[PDB]
Amino acid sequence: SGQKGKQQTESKGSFSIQY
């Protein structure tokens, strides 16, 4: 839950939740 990283449309971006 919370704010994730940069969720791209083309890719999933990176597995990291931003805090």
From Swiss-Prot:
Transglutaminase substrate. Rapidly cleaved after ejaculation by KLK3/PSA, resulting in liquefaction of the semen coagulum and the progressive release of motile spermatozoa. It is found in: Secreted. Residues 1-13 have a biased composition (Polar residues). Seminal vesicle. Occurs in disulfide-linked complexes which may also contain two less abundant 71- and 76-kDa semenogelin-related polypeptides. Belongs to the semenogelin family. Predominant protein in semen. It participates in the formation of a gel matrix entrapping the accessory gland secretions and ejaculated spermatozoa. Fragments of semenogelin and/or fragments of the related proteins may contribute to the activation of progressive sperm movements as the gel-forming proteins are fragmented by KLK3/PSA. Alpha-inhibin-92 and alpha-inhibin-31, derived from the proteolytic degradation of semenogelin, inhibit the secretion of pituitary follicle-stimulating hormone. This is Semenogelin-1.
